[PDB]
């Protein structure tokens, strides 16, 4: 039940092991490595699509 | 003007001669007084490093019968502040023609020698200046008020990133709130 | 390209087109998606930057002090009593409160860590020899029997969760799951507690998290000792919804959002810049 | 394009200078799902007798106007059978189609922000004092901001640049919003979904969202033009359903 | 359509009422070919530090304005690194994107011819006398025509109906031109290629073309409208290259 | 042959050749690659020696004390205050400074370890009984709110990284990643901070690493106690570029490379040797 | 061999007694890659108008000469269009071809170390005092060392055996170097790449490297030989590119 | 995710095990066993190659 995952490294021996010790999922560590996002709920929440090159009106 | 809605209202009017300045501020999106309480500026004060391009949108809120052209310029920080519209036409700039589309976007590019600038400002990571100038004038028909209004909006581009979490120097307390 | 990595900019040349990416309409509610490649000539840059530090788990996942609890081994009054309590809240400190109030509804698990420290009270003498002090931090769920004194039966903690800690060791720490009777913790509640639109206005009616009682389980000391217990909340497994505007004004109370009116930003002398 | 027609029930809105439609957080309103419900009794869904357009009273826009706010669903407490279903039920749930409309001329100028703020919990004008509910919102009356601070002993803090919430008024553009710029824009329509941390709620003890209308660029014109411009708000509920039938409330 | 966006270097021009683009004699500017070169040394081509937009000073348009002229490349002698490359090189070669811009109103009226005249060799006002070069063109100053004849002892003949060249001013529409009619037109953009009888040339002793801006229908409006309308000229070099590096000139 | 192992020498015999490995030219900038096999007769030696200790990771990877921070449980003045701070730098101690300044640009991760020790201040009496002391070492990134006093709100450390440590246990230790806004840490900067070639000359303008604030989180003691915290930097995952000449002269200041003029080496009485 | 010809732009260097070429740290200068850039705007690359040879003023070599230093790119601040591109741009990036030349005779003797030191940060002569920038380097003037220590109140420490950096002068042979031994060597050429911790930089607030020329064996000859020998420095930029076009600097 | 590597031993039961515990690569131990080198950037950085046996000029 060991989860070997990728460590946070830079860009131009890179793995860590995790064992879960407790029977509750609230006892687990933080989910540091989850970087998913979609900003279209806030920046472009209009009904008809608005292409950049075309005039807005 | 900060204690009213007059703080957001950039005034323009018909001119006697052209090429005068409308406004100007330093491009310090976490330290300058113009940009540090905006919604982009408040997130950056939780961090110590910022990187990426920004979008300055402008919105002409005058009458539909009034026309006008404007030059909005970004200057890299090497030479100093631009002193005229001739000094500002040498950097990154855009000429905005006020028409049926009320808005224009000046895109401030990331022109830096480091991959990150600092949120609290220093001289090593200075980012430059934003100025706006009358390209032509405001020309109106009769029976129209003189002074109009321009609204400036800030946002981050899709290559924007922040780094090194910190406490913000905006909220304080001397005791526990009871 | 990996998840969380920013976009590259593409090489763009000169244009003379009927396309107008710079001209838009703010009146539509739409934020324009203009890239620097659209308004000027750019080069191809391979951007390797990541949005790691800006995640909701990384922005929130640092422990912040939420309460300072004081109690002694000898009663002065009921503020420096043998025992003390604290209604569990996140609004008494300003640093964590401003970070949580950037969202309307959140849903997280907690880590509570205590930094308990003692100090000898000012006296005419201090020369004693005391065994190491042991503390109890009992959690009381909403509606349970609370300690009405020291030597109480309610400190028997047969069903309440307790922790015991001797001074000198590592700080105590436990994990708390998501505890709301709704589907999210409400940072804001625009309403009342009674159906007639009266009673208590605000988020106070949606915060029934219970109390946290502190004491020394040692019976006595030779000379009185004051203790201070700092409570540290670190939220983990965080979800958040409906991002709020950040707060301008400082806080005044813990149960209200009441403020004093302040200007929108700091000032300057003129609207232009005047050098060469 | 600039034309748009919205039909709900026995009512139609036509607009010849429309900016666009802002849809919430990208979510269209809908009925509650079976895997998200809590109450067990069968809901009632009056589809056309409630999900129709209800117009409110106009407000006079002046040069010295600071702004107005409406709190919902308490703004429609007496509007037909939407108001009769609130009284007879413990729980309710709905999204909205807010339509704000204001025409002036090609010789006027001004700009209005139209925000929909979920849980716009307001502070008190005189602090260390709880305020009355009729100062927060009457039944359909437009509660209005002020240019300077309020010293009301039992009212909200109505200074408009703090927006009643202790925040900067310029940062309200994360909430679902449009602008009515009189140079180009005639109306502004926002479709809000149901936003709450619970699947249904009581529609009297809770203001789910607050509609604010704020002049950022103030109204100015020649004195020989029309000196009266009104601002009308037309709101349609969407996918409204109810639970917990008992006697008529609401105490 | 009426919208157009021109991006050159770190500068952008936006126009919401564009007539069209006039491209020269149907030729786009480009670099010199190998089968047409004469000089043997390698040219220098600063692609974005020189082929960017450089705006000049505005001129006030009045009812009694006869017109203005600019002579090129001497009009951009001090405009950034386009002016620094002229001083250090014997030869140069470039085409241009001339953009003239003037907005008034729907209550003004006027019309401007915007011609680009190659080799607009001007006669003298007082004949049997050679004129000074600073009366033909200063470095960025708009040299202006007159309504009647000129009696300057060392200047050009600035009567506008003869256009300084002894021809009829109405016949200038064979040179690449647009019109700025204030009823319909906001700006006017002309793309000029390199026109010369030699492949490269010296950019100081030779004015390659002259931009004239002439009111055919004069500016008139109500006295209660805006009495000041300016005319701004924004010029971008295109495919500029240089040869013959030596010390800084230009004698 | 393994990586890092020195070269063997080969067996060479007598020569009478037109080849001249001994004769070269220093004027070319070239260091001659002459082996002892080229200029004399050698035997075959299998050299098993390794260059392990001479690696940049092994030469740098030992912890060195970089600062000694002093603070007390009772203020004497603002130098012996309740709290203290230190701008993070590597130039106040001379042993680590000379090792880092052998390179122009470096890029490393850090280990910071604190050796905190207390001592009872000189008094007319010492006979007391105090609970164990607990310390806080809060890092403040460049531009954050600094503690202006004891009992400050800025010690709530909701977003700043803090550490807490009771006396008696193991020394505290955390890891720091590579933190420069450029692509390497600059040990040297030949330039100014302002574009007009004025302001601050040297490496000081490229060192914005923040502060490190120290305190006792205990409120009081019966008699005042002075603490000393030693800061230990160990660089790991080290890269280095452009090797510098070692420094001859001792240091004078921490923000400069200013020196006093000294001779190139120590002397002797004559240039020859005079015995048999 | 001893002959070598270096051609860059419209300039050629010929040498009949060349030692070799020292190339940096084994790296040839080149333009910045796409996976290493930070700025997004298009760079300008004047290939032959900037990457040409620029010669400086000669310095008189005497028996009592301690040495000279030049700081770069500030040594070429006014040298043609390399100096005009520094003023108009925020960032710049270049490698160099340094060529130092000094001939005497077969009857003279001397030896010069020619080092290129990256980030040669100099200490102050009078300590606890910041020095002026014009004492570190003028625009093209050779700043010169001294045989004994300096007591200048606002200048660097110019004692040559400490090399201004607090190090031993004998240990400068790790930096890219040659020697000019008058017995055998006529000139000395070093090709330096771009060395910095950032991909581009400002070329005014930062001296990227310092060229030192130091007599290790002093100049001595018969009194009836030529008593004047000069030392000329000819420097060519290589693959120079620029970013951040704005007005002319440099404050 | 165990990396068994070779221990540092002499010349004339020699292995160690490493588990990575943390999610950041800056949390890792030192890279002690990396002895790669190439000194030709400094000792022989000339353009034309210089053979030892041949004359340098
Ligand atoms: C002695 C053992 C102590 C055990 C401690 C248990 C106390 C924790 C239980 C309640 C947890 C409440 C979490 C608080 C969340 C915030 O109030 C929300 N952000 C606001 O609704
Ligand atoms: C209480 C928790 C303390 C956490 C400590 C964090 C402090 C470390 C952050 C900054 C690290 C800076 C590393 C310094 C590198 C040198 O200055 C470079 N060699 C010179 O540029």
Q: SS3 for D101-143, per residue?
A: ECCCCCCCEEEEEEEEEECCCCCECCCCCCCCHHHHCCCCCCE
Q: For residues A55 and D128, give the distance between their C-alpha atoms in angstroms, rounded to a whole number.
A: 52
β-pair partners for F214:
F84, F137
Residue D218 included in any domain: yes
Question: Would you call H22 and A13 a contact, using CB atoms and an 8 Å cutoff?
Answer: no
Is D74 in a helix, a strand, or coil? helix
Q: Which residue has the tokens 């003869």?
A: E162
Contacts for C42 with CB less than 8 Å, ≥ 6 apart? B109, C9, C10, C11, C12, C36, G40, G41, G42
Question: Would you call B97 and E230 a contact, using CB atoms and an 8 Å cutoff?
Answer: no
Q: Do B126 and B77 meet the contact criterion of CB atoms below 8 Å apart?
A: yes
Question: Would you call B155 and A56 a contact, using CB atoms and an 8 Å cutoff?
Answer: no
* CA of residue C209 to ligand 1 center, whole Å: 6
Contacts for C191 with CB less than 8 Å, ≥ 6 apart? C201, C205, D205, D206, D207
Q: For residues E214 and D101, give the distance between their C-alpha atoms in angstroms, rounded to a whole number.
A: 46
Token pair belonging to E232: 């701004």
Q: For residues D203 and E16, give the distance between their C-alpha atoms in angstroms, rounded to a whole number.
A: 49
- In this structure, what DSSP letter does residue C15 have? E
Shortest CA distance to G130 belongs to which of B79, F194, F247, F99? F194
The reply to whether ligand 1 has any atom less than 6 angstroms from the CB of C96 is no
Q: In degrees to the nearest 10, what's the CA dihedral of H11, H16, H20, H21?
A: -130
Residues from chain F that touch B125, judged by Cβ atoms under 8 A, are 181
Distances (CA, A) of G67 to E140, F28, G74, G143, G158: 49, 20, 19, 9, 9
Find the domain containing A53 and state its range. Answer: 1-57
- Elucidated via: cryo-EM
Shortest CA distance to B36 belongs to which of E250, G120, C267? C267
Q: Do B48 and F144 meet the contact criterion of CB atoms below 8 Å apart?
A: yes
Token pair belonging to D214: 């704020």
Q: What are phi and psi of A2, to 5 degrees?
A: -85, 130
Token pair belonging to D1: 């394009």
Q: For residues C206 and G161, give the distance between their C-alpha atoms in angstroms, rounded to a whole number.
A: 77
Is D75 in a helix, a strand, or coil? helix
Long-range contacts formed by F144-147: CB under 8 A, 24+ apart: F144/B48, F144/B166, F144/B167, F144/B168, F144/B169, F144/F210, F145/B167, F145/B168, F145/B169, F145/B172, F146/F85, F146/F211, F146/F213, F147/F83, F147/F85, F147/F213, F147/F215
The reply to whether ligand 1 has any atom less than 6 angstroms from the CB of C185 is yes
Q: For residues G222 and D56, give the distance between their C-alpha atoms in angstroms, rounded to a whole number.
A: 110
Q: For residues E153 and G246, give the distance between their C-alpha atoms in angstroms, rounded to a whole number.
A: 42
- Give the resolution to one decimal, in Å: 2.9
Token pair belonging to G148: 């004994």
Question: Would you call B101 and A43 a contact, using CB atoms and an 8 Å cutoff?
Answer: no
Q: Min CA distance, A37 vs chain C (Å)?
A: 8
Q: For residues D208 and D198, give the distance between their C-alpha atoms in angstroms, rounded to a whole number.
A: 11
Question: Would you call F55 and H11 a contact, using CB atoms and an 8 Å cutoff?
Answer: no
The reply to whether ligand 2 has any atom less than 6 angstroms from the CB of F72 is no
Q: Min CA distance, F165 vs chain G (Å)?
A: 37
Q: For residues E39 and E20, give the distance between their C-alpha atoms in angstroms, rounded to a whole number.
A: 37
* Cis peptide, bond prior to residue B110, ω within 30 of zero: no
Q: Do E203 and E83 meet the contact criterion of CB atoms below 8 Å apart?
A: no
Q: Do D179 and B47 meet the contact criterion of CB atoms below 8 Å apart?
A: no
Token pair belonging to D172: 């309200």
Question: Would you call C195 and D250 a contact, using CB atoms and an 8 Å cutoff?
Answer: yes
Question: Would you call D107 and B42 a contact, using CB atoms and an 8 Å cutoff?
Answer: no
Ligand 2 nearest atom to the CA of residue F206, by list position:
21
Ligand 2 nearest atom to the CA of residue F203, by list position:
21
Q: Do B24 and B10 meet the contact criterion of CB atoms below 8 Å apart?
A: no
β-pair partners for C114:
C231
Q: Which residue has the tokens 């500068």?
A: E11
F 3-32 → G contacts, CB under 8 A: 25-30
β-pair partners for A17:
A4
Q: What are phi and psi of F49, to 5 degrees?
A: -70, 155
* Cis peptide, bond prior to residue E184, ω within 30 of zero: no
Q: Do C32 and B57 meet the contact criterion of CB atoms below 8 Å apart?
A: yes
Shortest CB distance from C95 goes to which of F159, F221, F223? F159
Shortest CA distance to B41 belongs to which of B122, B151, B160, B131? B160
Cβ burial of D174 (10 Å; 0-12, 13-18, 19+) is middle
Token pair belonging to C5: 């990595």
The reply to whether ligand 2 has any atom less than 6 angstroms from the CB of F227 is no
Shortest CA distance to G156 belongs to which of B85, E75, F190, C91? F190
Token pair belonging to B153: 């909006």
Sign of dihedral through CA atoms D181, D183, D187, D188? negative
Shortest CA distance to G22 belongs to which of H40, D102, D157? H40
What beta strand segments (E) does chain E contain? 4-8, 11-15, 21-23, 54-55, 59-61, 68-72, 89-101, 109-118, 143-144, 177-181, 187-192, 209-220, 229-245
Altogether, the residues listed in chain H come to a count of: 57
Q: Do B129 and B38 meet the contact criterion of CB atoms below 8 Å apart?
A: no
Residue G250 included in any domain: no
Residue D250 included in any domain: no
Q: For residues G235 and C93, give the distance between their C-alpha atoms in angstroms, rounded to a whole number.
A: 63
- CB burial of F28-58 (b: ≥16 within 10 Å; e: otherwise) equals bbbebeeeebbeeeeeeeeeeebeeeebbbb
Residues from chain B that touch A55, judged by Cβ atoms under 8 A, are 100-101
Q: Which residue has the tokens 């010849």?
A: D16
Residues from chain H that touch A8, judged by Cβ atoms under 8 A, are 23-25
Q: For residues C241 and C107, give the distance between their C-alpha atoms in angstroms, rounded to a whole number.
A: 9
User: Cβ–Cβ contacts within 10 Å for residue B95, how many?
Assistant: 28
Distances (CA, A) of H31 to B63, E134, F58: 69, 73, 8
Shortest CA distance to B39 belongs to which of B117, B152, B155? B155
Token pair belonging to D46: 């009056």
Q: For residues F276 and F254, give the distance between their C-alpha atoms in angstroms, rounded to a whole number.
A: 50
Is G218 in a helix, a strand, or coil? strand
Contacts for C31 with CB less than 8 Å, ≥ 6 apart? A42, A43, A44, B55, B155
Contacts for E85 with CB less than 8 Å, ≥ 6 apart? E44, E46, E50, E92, E240, E242, G49, G81
Q: For residues E173 and E181, give the distance between their C-alpha atoms in angstroms, rounded to a whole number.
A: 15
Q: What are phi and psi of C189, to 5 degrees?
A: -140, 110
Residue G232 included in any domain: yes
- In this structure, what DSSP letter does residue C172 have? P
Contacts for B83 with CB less than 8 Å, ≥ 6 apart? C275, C276
Q: For residues D8 and A50, give the distance between their C-alpha atoms in angstroms, rounded to a whole number.
A: 25
Element (H, E) at C39: helix C36-39
Nearest residue on chain B to A56, alpha-carbon basis: B101
Question: Would you call F202 and G198 a contact, using CB atoms and an 8 Å cutoff?
Answer: no
Nearest residue on chain C to G39, alpha-carbon basis: C45
Please give the tally of structural domains in chain G: 1
Please give the tally of structural domains in chain H: 1
| Nearest-ligand number for the alpha carbon of C116 | 1
- In this structure, what DSSP letter does residue D43 have? P
Altogether, the residues listed in chain E come to a count of: 251
The distance from CA E129 to its chain's CA centroid, rounded to whole angstroms, is 27
Q: For residues D82 and D89, give the distance between their C-alpha atoms in angstroms, rounded to a whole number.
A: 11
Protein residue whose Cα sits closest to atom 2 of ligand 1 = C162
Q: Report CA Rg, chain E.
A: 19
Q: Do chains E and B touch (3 or more CB pairs under 8 A)?
A: yes
* CA of residue F52 to ligand 2 center, whole Å: 27
Residues from chain C that touch E5, judged by Cβ atoms under 8 A, are 15-23
Is E16 in a helix, a strand, or coil? coil
β-pair partners for C69:
C229
Shortest CA distance to B94 belongs to which of B147, B131, B66? B131
Q: For residues E101 and E96, give the distance between their C-alpha atoms in angstroms, rounded to a whole number.
A: 16
Is G160 in a helix, a strand, or coil? helix
Q: For residues F58 and D21, give the distance between their C-alpha atoms in angstroms, rounded to a whole number.
A: 64
Q: Sort residue C170 into left (φ over 0), alpha (ψ -120 to 50) or beta.
A: beta
Nearest residue on chain C to A57, alpha-carbon basis: C25
Q: For residues G90 and G244, give the distance between their C-alpha atoms in angstroms, rounded to a whole number.
A: 5
The reply to whether ligand 1 has any atom less than 6 angstroms from the CB of C139 is yes
Residues from chain C that touch A43, judged by Cβ atoms under 8 A, are 30-31, 33
Element (H, E) at G12: strand G11-15
Long-range contacts formed by H11-15: CB under 8 A, 24+ apart: H11/F48
CA angle C231, C234, C238 (to 5 degrees): 145
Q: What CATH number is associated with residue D58?
A: 2.60.120.20
Residue D32 included in any domain: yes
CA angle D142, D143, D145 (to 5 degrees): 125
Residue E250 included in any domain: no
Q: Do E217 and E86 meet the contact criterion of CB atoms below 8 Å apart?
A: no
Residue D148 included in any domain: yes
Q: For residues F19 and F7, give the distance between their C-alpha atoms in angstroms, rounded to a whole number.
A: 23
Shortest CA distance to B86 belongs to which of B131, B19, B25, B138? B19
Q: Do E29 and E98 meet the contact criterion of CB atoms below 8 Å apart?
A: no
Token pair belonging to D34: 């079976």
Q: For residues F174 and A21, give the distance between their C-alpha atoms in angstroms, rounded to a whole number.
A: 24
Cβ burial of B58 (10 Å; 0-12, 13-18, 19+) is buried
Q: For residues C137 and C114, give the distance between their C-alpha atoms in angstroms, rounded to a whole number.
A: 9
Q: Where are the domains of chain B?
A: 1-178
Chain F contact present for H36, CB below 8 A? yes
- CB burial of C126-157 (b: ≥16 within 10 Å; e: otherwise) equals beeebeebebbbbbbeeeeeebeeeeeebbee
Chain H contact present for G29, CB below 8 A? no
Ligand 1 nearest atom to the CA of residue C174, by list position:
4
- In this structure, what DSSP letter does residue G81 have? H
Q: For residues D199 and B11, give the distance between their C-alpha atoms in angstroms, rounded to a whole number.
A: 47
- In chain D, the largest separation of any two C-alpha atoms, in whole Å, equals 63
Q: Do chains B and H touch (3 or more CB pairs under 8 A)?
A: no
Question: Would you call A45 and D25 a contact, using CB atoms and an 8 Å cutoff?
Answer: yes
Is D145 in a helix, a strand, or coil? coil
Nearest residue on chain C to D20, alpha-carbon basis: C28
* CA of residue F176 to ligand 2 center, whole Å: 7
Nearest residue on chain G to H55, alpha-carbon basis: G1
What beta strand segments (E) does G109-172 contain? 109-118, 143-144
Is G208 in a helix, a strand, or coil? coil
Find the domain containing E153 and state its range. Answer: 4-245
Residues from chain B that touch E80, judged by Cβ atoms under 8 A, are 90
Q: What are phi and psi of C149, to 5 degrees?
A: -170, 180
Question: Would you call B89 and E55 a contact, using CB atoms and an 8 Å cutoff?
Answer: yes
Residues from chain A that touch H2, judged by Cβ atoms under 8 A, are 17
């Amino acid at each position: 039940g060991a989860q070997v995952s990728t460590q946070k490294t830079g860009a131009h021996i890179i793995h860590y092991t995790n064992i879960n010790y407790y029977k509750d999922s609230a006892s687990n560590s933080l989910n540091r490595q989850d970087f998913t996002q979609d900003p279209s709920k806030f920046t472009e929440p209009v009904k008809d699509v608005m292409i950049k090159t075309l005039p807005a009106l | 003007h900060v204690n009213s809605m007059e703080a957001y209202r950039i005034p323009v009017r018909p001119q006697t001669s052209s090429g005068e300045q409308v406004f100007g501020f330093q491009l310090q999106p976490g330290h300058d007084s113009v940009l540090k309480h905006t919604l982009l500026g408040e997130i950056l004060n939780y961090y110590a490093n910022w990187s990426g391009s920004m979008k300055l949108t402008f919105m002409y809120c005058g009458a539909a019968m009034a026309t006008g052209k404007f030059l909005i310029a970004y200057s890299p920080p090497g030479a100093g502040v631009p002193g005229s519209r001739r000094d500002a036409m040498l950097g990154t700039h855009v000429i905005w023609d006020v028409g049926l589309q009320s808005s224009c976007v000046l895109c401030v590019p990331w022109i830096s020698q480091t991959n990150y600038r600092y949120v609290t400002s220093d001289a090593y990571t200075d980012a430059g200046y934003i100025t706006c100038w009358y390209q032509t004038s405001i020309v109106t028909p009769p029976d129209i008020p003189t002074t109009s209004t321009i609204l400036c909006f800030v946002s981050a581009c899709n290559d924007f990133s922040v780094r090194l979490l910190r406490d913000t120097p905006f909220i304080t307390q001397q005791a526990l709130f009871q | 390209r990996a998840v969380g990595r920013v976009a590259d900019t593409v090489a763009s040349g000169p244009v003379n087109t009927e396309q107008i990416p710079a001209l838009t309409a703010v009146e539509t509610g739409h934020t324009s998606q203009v890239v620097p490649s659209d308004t000027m000539q750019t080069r191809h840059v391979i951007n390797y930057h990541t949005r790691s530090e800006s995640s909701i788990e990384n922005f929130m996942g640092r422990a912040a002090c939420v309460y300072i609890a004081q109690y002694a081994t000898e009663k002065v009054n009921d503020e420096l009593d043998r025992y003390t309590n604290w209604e569990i809240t996140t609004r008494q400190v300003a640093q964590l409160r401003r970070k949580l109030e950037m969202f309307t509804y959140m849903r997280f698990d907690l880590e509570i860590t205590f930094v308990i420290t003692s100090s000898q009270r000012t006296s005419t003498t201090y020369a004693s020899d005391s065994p190491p002090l042991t503390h109890q931090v009992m959690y009381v769920p909403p509606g349970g029997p609370i300690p009405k004194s020291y030597e109480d039966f309610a400190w028997q903690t047969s069903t309440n969760p307790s922790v015991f800690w001797t001074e000198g060791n590592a700080p105590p720490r436990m994990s708390i799951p998501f505890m709301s009777v709704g589907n999210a913790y409400c940072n804001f509640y625009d309403g009342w507690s009674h159906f007639s639109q009266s009673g208590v206005y605000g988020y106070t009616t949606l915060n029934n998290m219970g109390h946290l009682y502190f004491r020394h389980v040692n019976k006595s000391t030779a000379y009185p000792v004051n203790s201070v217990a700092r409570v540290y909340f670190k939220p983990k497994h965080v979800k958040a919804w409906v991002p709020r505007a950040p707060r301008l004004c400082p806080y005044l109370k813990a149960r209200n959002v009441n403020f004093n009116v302040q200007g929108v930003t700091e000032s300057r002398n003129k609207i232009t810049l005047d050098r060469s | 394009d600039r034309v748009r027609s919205i039909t709900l029930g026995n009512s139609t809105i036509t607009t010849q200078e429309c900016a666009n439609v802002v849809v919430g957080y990208g979510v269209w309103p809908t009925y509650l799902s079976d895997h998200e419900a809590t109450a067990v009794d069968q809901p009632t869904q009056p589809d056309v007798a409630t999900c129709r357009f209800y117009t409110l009273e106009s407000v006079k826009w002046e040069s010295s106007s600071a702004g107005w706010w409406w709190k919902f669903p308490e703004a429609l407490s007496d509007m037909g059978l939407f108001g009769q279903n609130m009284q007879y039920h413990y729980l309710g749930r709905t999204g909205y189609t807010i339509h704000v409309q204001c025409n002036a001329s090609k010789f006027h100028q001004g700009c209005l922000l139209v925000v929909c703020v979920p849980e716009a919990e307001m502070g008190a004008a005189t602090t260390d004092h709880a305020f009355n509910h009729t100062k927060l919102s009457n039944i359909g009356q437009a509660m209005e901001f002020s240019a300077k601070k309020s010293t009301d002993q039992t009212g909200p803090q109505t200074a408009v640049h703090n927006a009643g919430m202790g925040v900067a008024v310029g940062n309200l553009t994360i909430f679902p919003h449009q602008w009515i710029n009189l140079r180009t824009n005639n109306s502004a329509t926002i479709v809000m979904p149901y936003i709450n941390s619970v699947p249904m709620d009581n529609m009297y003890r809770h203001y789910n969202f607050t509609l604010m209308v704020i002049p950022f660029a103030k109204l100015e014109h020649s004195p020989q033009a029309s000196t009266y411009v009104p601002i009308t708000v037309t709101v349609a509920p969407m996918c409204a359903e109810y639970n917990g039938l008992r006697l008529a409330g609401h105490q």
